Amino acid sequence: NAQAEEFKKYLETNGIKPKQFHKKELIFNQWDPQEYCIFLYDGITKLTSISENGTIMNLQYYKGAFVIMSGFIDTETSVGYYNLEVISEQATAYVIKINELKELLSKNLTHFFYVFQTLQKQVSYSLAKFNDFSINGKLGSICGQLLILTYVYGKETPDGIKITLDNLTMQELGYSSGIAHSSAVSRIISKLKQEKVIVYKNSCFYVQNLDYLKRYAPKLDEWFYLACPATWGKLN
Amino acid sequence: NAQAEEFKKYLETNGIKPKQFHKKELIFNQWDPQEYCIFLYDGITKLTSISENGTIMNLQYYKGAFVIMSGFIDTETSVGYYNLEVISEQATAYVIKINELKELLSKNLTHFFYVFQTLQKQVSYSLAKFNDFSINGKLGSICGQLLILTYVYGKETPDGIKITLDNLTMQELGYSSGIAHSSAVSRIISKLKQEKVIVYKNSCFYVQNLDYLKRYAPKLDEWFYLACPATWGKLN
DNA sequence: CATCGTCGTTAACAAATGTTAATGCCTAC
DNA sequence: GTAGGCATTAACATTTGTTAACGACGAT
Ligand SMILES: N[C@@H](CCC(=O)N[C@@H](CS)C(=O)NCC(=O)O)C(=O)O
Ligand SMILES: N[C@@H](CCC(=O)N[C@@H](CS)C(=O)NCC(=O)O)C(=O)O
C-alpha cells in the first residue's frame, strides 16, 4: 500500500518499465491467447465478458494498486476469457509475462505474499458480492454495487457523498449488476431517490444516507471493514 | 490430485494432525470466528452464510483435495464470517490456523504454487459463477448450479447423466442459487423439464442434454474446460 | 403391524424486472 | 445543424416471491 509501492520498485529493479494506457483501451482481451500478470499501479479499470451474441457483463472494477492475472502460474494457461478495459482517462500498469513472474516470485517472499494477499482479498470480495446480489433481486444488486463505489470512489462533501467516477453511465451500472436494460435500471434508480438515500445533482451521484445500502448489502460492508479498514474507516 | 497429495504429507511432516469431521459439524463458523487455513483432502463440504433475518445461502461446495481460507496470512485477521459445513458422511480435513502457515510456505515454493493455484482456480470459479447467474436470473442460476453438480458430482448410466449426491433436496438446491422457497424451485424444475431437461425419478436429479445447461451457464462450462479439464472430459 | 413427519407438487395471487417504445435533452463532430 | 447517446416514463409480458393446500414417501 506501502506493500504495492515497494513492489513497483521491485519491478523497476528487474527492468520492467510501466506502460501508460488511455481510456477505452483494452490491456488484454478475451481472445488474446497469451496470458499476463498485470500490476495496476494507478488508474481505474473494469473487467468485462462478452457472450456469443453480444450480451456483455461487467464482472467488477479494479482501482489503484492491485494485480490482475489472466493465467495460472505453473501451467501458464488461461484462467478464463475476460477483457480488462480502462475506465480512467489514463492508467499506469506494469505488463509482465506469466512465463517470468514465478521466477520473479521465487525470489523473496515479501512481494510473493503480496500477490497472494491480493488474490486472497479477491476470493473474499467475490464471495460477499455473490452473497448479497442473490439473496435479494436486482434491487439488491444495485445497492450492493453502489455500496462498493461509495467507499472506494466516494468523497465526503457537505451536500452528501459524491462518487468521483466522472462519468458514470446508467447503462454501465446495469452492466455491473445483472440488469441488461437502461430502462429497468432507471425504474430502480429513482425508485432510488426515494425513501431517504442518494441524490443525482448536476450530473453526478451523491450518497446521503448509507445504512439503507448497508442493510441491503451487509456482507460487502462487513468485507470492507475486514479487508479494507482504512477505506471503510473514512466514512464511519 | 497427483500435485495435491505430495503436498499432503508435507503437512504431517512438520507435524499437523489428520482430523476426522463427520456429517453436520462445521470446521469453522460464523459466530465463533476463528481463522484457519483448511486443506480438505477428501469429502464434500459446503460454504454457508447466515444473515440476521435468518435467510441462508450456499456460496459453494468444496470437495476432494482443496484449500479453504478463513484468514489472511499477513494480518491473520478474518476474511469473512462463514460456515464450512460438511455435506459428506466422511471427511478428513487438515486444520491450519493462520499464524502457522505463513512461512510453512516460505518453506519451499513448490508446494506454495499449489496453494496459490487453488486460489486462482477459486477466483475464476467465482467470476464464472457470478457471470452466468446474473445475466439470466434464477432460471440461469439453477442451470448453472445444476451444470456444476452435473460435472464435479457426475454419473453416467444409459440415463443421460447424473449427480452422485443424495440428500440433495430442493430447498437446499434453492439455497445454492438465490431461491429461498422450496416451491419456487419445483416450479422451475417442473417447468425446466417439460423442456424435459432432467428427470427427478428415483428421488434424485437425472439430466439429459448438457447443451441446454451449457447454453444457460456458458462461463461455468468454459471454466471447467480451462481449469479442471479432466473433469470436463468425462461428460464431454 | 403402522404413522408423523418430512418433502415434492400444484395452484393462485402479490410483486419485481424483462422488454419494447416514445419523448425531449444533450454533447459530439 | 445534425445524428446519435443518454435519462426518463408508460404500458405490458414474463419471471419471481410468497403462502398454502394436497399427497406421496420414508426414516423410525
Ligand atoms: N487498492 C485497493 C483496491 C483494490 C481493488 O480494486 N479491489 C477490488 C476488489 S479485489 C475492488 O474493490 N473493486 C471495486 C469494484 O468492484 O467496483 C486495495 O488494495 O484494496
Ligand atoms: N478437488 C477438486 C474439486 C475442488 C473444488 O471443489 N473446487 C470448487 C471451485 S473453487 C468447486 O468445484 N465447487 C463446485 C460446487 O460449488 O458445487 C478439483 O480441484 O478438481
Does residue A199 contact residue A192 with C-beta atoms inside 8 Å?
A: no
C-alpha B26/C-alpha B47 separation (Å) is 10
| Distance separating alpha carbons of residues B50 and B183, to the nearest angstrom | 21
**Quick one: which of A53, A97, A50, A90 has its CA closest to A71?**
A97
Place of cell 471493514: A225
Chain A residue whose CA is closest to B71? A120
Distance of alpha carbon A224 from alpha carbon A150, whole angstroms: 11
* Facing residue for B80 by CB, picked from A102, A119, A219: A219
Minimum distance, in Å, between the CA of residue B130 and any CA atom of chain A? 6
Chain-centroid distance, C-alpha B158:
27
- Domain boundary assignment for chain B: 1-108, 136-236
* Pairwise CA distance, residues B25 & B153, whole Å: 21
Per CB-CB distance under 8 Å, the chain B contacts of A77 are 226
CA distance A73 to B158: 39
Query: Residues of B with CB below 8 A from A109's CB?
Result: 103, 106
Residue among A71, A28, A232 nearest B227 (CA): A71
Question: Is B134 in Cβ contact with A57 (below 8 Å)?
Answer: yes
How far apart are the CA of B157 and the nearest CA of chain A, in angstroms?
A: 31
Instruction: State how far the alpha carbon of B167 is from the alpha carbons of B163, B171, B173, B203, B204, in Å.
Output: 11, 11, 10, 10, 9
CA distance B100 to A56: 43
CB of A178 within 8 A of CB of B134? Answer: yes
With helix as H, strand as E and coil as C, how does chain A read? CCHHHHHHHHHHHCCCCCEEEECCCEEECCCCCCCEEEEEEECEEEEEEECCCCCEEEEEEEECCEEEECECCCCCCECCCCEEEECCCEEEEEEEECCCCHHHHHCCHHHHHHHHHHHHHHHHHHHHHHHHHHHCCHHHHHHHHHHHHHHHCEEEECCEEEECCCCCCHHHHHHHCCCCCHHHHHHHHCCCCCCCCCCEECCEEEECCCHHHHHHCHHHHHHHHHHCHHHHHCCC
Q: What are phi and psi of A15, to 5 degrees?
A: 65, 35
- Centre of ligand 2 to C-alpha A36, Å, is 24
Task: Tell whether domain A136-236 is in CATH 1.20.1260.10.
Answer: no
| DSSP-H helix ranges across B21-136 | 98-101, 109-135
List the one residue out of A43, A36, A193, A164 whose CA is nearest residue A101.
Answer: A36
DSSP state of B105: T
> Torsion-angle region of residue A76: left (phi > 0), alpha (psi -120 to 50) or beta?
left
The set of cell numbers assigned to B30 is 460464523
Angle at B158 between CA B154 and CA B164, to 5 degrees: 25
Q: Contact A120/B177, CB-based, under 8 Å? A: no
Task: Return the bridge partners of A118, or none.
Answer: none
Contact B161, B154 (CB under 8 A): yes
Angstrom distance (rounded) from CA A181 to CA A176 = 12
Q: What is the DSSP letter of B37?
A: E
Q: Pull the grid cell for residue B1.
A: 490430485
Cell of A15: 527492468
The total of other beta-carbon atoms located within 10 Å of residue A202's CB is: 6
How many Å apart are CA B214 and CA B227, to the nearest integer?
16
Residue nearest to nucleotide C17 (CA to C1'): A184
Of chain B, the end-to-end C-alpha distance in Å amounts to: 20
Experimental method: X-ray
B194 CA – D14 C1', rounded, Å: 18
Measured from the Cβ of residue A15, the count of other Cβ atoms closer than 10 Å reads 6
With b for 16 or more beta-carbon neighbours within 10 A and e for fewer, the A76-86 pattern comes to: eebbbbbbbbb
Scanning every strand, the nucleotide with its C1' closest to A139's CA turns out to be C16
CB contact at 8 A, A50 and A83: yes
Q: Which of B38, B66, B142 to mutate to test the pocket of ligand 2 (most atoms within 8 A of CB)?
A: B66
Owner of C-alpha cell 445483472: A178
- Contact between A154 and A147 under an 8 Å Cβ cutoff? The reply is no
Instruction: Please answer whether residues A26 and A133 qualify as being in contact, where contact means their C-beta atoms are separated by less than 8 angstroms.
Output: no
Quoted resolution (Å): 3.0
Q: B18: which DSSP letter?
A: -
Q: Which helix (H) or strand (E) holds B224?
A: helix B218-226
Question: CA B119, CA B56: separation in Å to the nearest integer?
Answer: 24
Tell me if A7 sits within 8 A of A64, measured CB to CB: no
For residue B50, the SS3 value is: strand
Return d(Cα B200, Cα A62) in angstroms, integer: 43
The alpha carbon of residue B63 and the mean position of all alpha carbons in its chain are separated, in whole angstroms, by 6
Using CA atoms, how far residue A222 sits from A235, B50, B79, in Å, is 13, 13, 10
Closest residue CA from atom 14 of ligand 2: B61
Listed residue (A108, A126, A35) closest to A73, CA to CA: A35
Of the candidates A32, A130, A126, the one whose C-alpha atom is nearest the C-alpha of residue A81 is A32
- Please state, in angstroms and rounded to a whole number, the distance separating the CA atoms of residues B148 and A46: 27
Which CB contacts under 8 angstroms, 24+ apart, belong to B226-233?
A: B226/A77, B226/A78, B226/A79, B226/A80, B226/B124, B227/A72, B227/A79, B227/B121, B227/B124, B227/B125, B228/B121, B228/B151, B228/B152, B231/B151, B231/B152, B231/B154, B232/B151
Gap between the Cα atoms of A2 and A26, Å rounded? 27
Q: How far is the CA of B28 from the CAs of A20, A220, B120, in angstroms?
A: 44, 20, 22
Of A77, A120, A135, the CB nearest to B69: A120
User: What is the Å distance from ligand 1's center to A55 Cα?
Assistant: 25
B1-108 and B136-236: identical CATH topology: no
Distance CA A54, CA A187 (A): 24
Q: Is the peptide bond before A29 cis (omega within 30 degrees of 0)?
A: no
Asked if B116's CB is within 8 angstroms of A223's CB, the reply is: no
Cβ-based burial of B78 (10 A; exposed 0-12, middle 13-18, buried ≥19): buried
C-alpha cell belonging to residue A3: 506493500
- Is domain B1-108 classified as CATH 3.40.50.2030? no
Nearest Cα to B222, choosing from B160, B133, B107, B132?
A: B132
DSSP B149-184: HHHHTEE-SSSS-EE--SS--HHHHHHHSS---HHH
B151 alpha carbon – ligand 2 mean position (Å): 10
Residues A8 and A64 sit within 8 Å (Cβ to Cβ): no
Q: A-B interface: how many C-beta pairs under 8 angstroms?
A: 127
